[PDB]
Amino acid sequence: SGAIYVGNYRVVNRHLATHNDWANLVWEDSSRDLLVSSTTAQGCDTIARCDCQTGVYYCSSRRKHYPVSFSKPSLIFVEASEYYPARYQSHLMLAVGHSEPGDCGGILRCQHGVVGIVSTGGNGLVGFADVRDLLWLDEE
Numbered sequence: 001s002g003a004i005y006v007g008n009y010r011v012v013n014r015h016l017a018t019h020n021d022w023a024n025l026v027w028e029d030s031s032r033d034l035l036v037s038s039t040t041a042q043g044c045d046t047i048a049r050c051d052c053q054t055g056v057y058y059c060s061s062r063r064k065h066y067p068v069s070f071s072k073p074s075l076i077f078v079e080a081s082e083y084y085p086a087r088y089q090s091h092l093m094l095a096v097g098h099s100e101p102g103d104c105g106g107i108l109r110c111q112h113g114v115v116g117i118v119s120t121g122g123n124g125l126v127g128f129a130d131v132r133d134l135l136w137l138d139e140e
């Protein structure tokens with residue numbers, strides 16, 4: 001589990017969104033596994049605006065933050081899980097890093113701020129959903 005809290009937005013994995021998220025929906029995209037809902041309180045996270053390929057992510061199944069090298073956001077075939085059929089997921093970045101289902105939502109960050117959240121993984125893979133192209137998270 002986990003979310004990004006930037007401005008009056010909450011960014012979560014679409015497959016983990018709650019009824020309150022769907023009832024206060026700003027934007028969602030199944031191909032990216034992302035959903036954004038509105039919040040009453042302002043958040044403290046800042047979004048990175050960059051092309052970094054190194055950063056650190058939080059792994060809840062190890063209670064640890066790990067430094068990783070990750071690929072640029074791309075369209076990658078991901079295997080069936082409880083939440084999506086084997087399909088192509090867009091804006092996804094891969095790294096070698098330990099992963100399990102309850103980790104979705106952990107933040108990946110670089111020197112500039114939050115880069116994305118954990119979404120896919122398996123066999124020493126972990127795939128993040130990028131948010132650096134969503135410039136509107138910084139305003140309104």
Ligand SMILES: O=C(NCCc1cocn1)N1CCc2ccccc21
Pocket residue numbers: 015033078079080081082083084089099100101102103104119120121122123
């Ligand atoms: O179950 C999921 N993610 C579900 C969301 C998803 C995105 O694309 C398809 N399903 N993951 C995330 C971490 C992990 C480690 C080992 C095995 C699976 C998984």
Ligand SMILES: [Zn+2]
Pocket residue numbers: 048049050051052110111112113
């Ligand atoms: Zn960066």
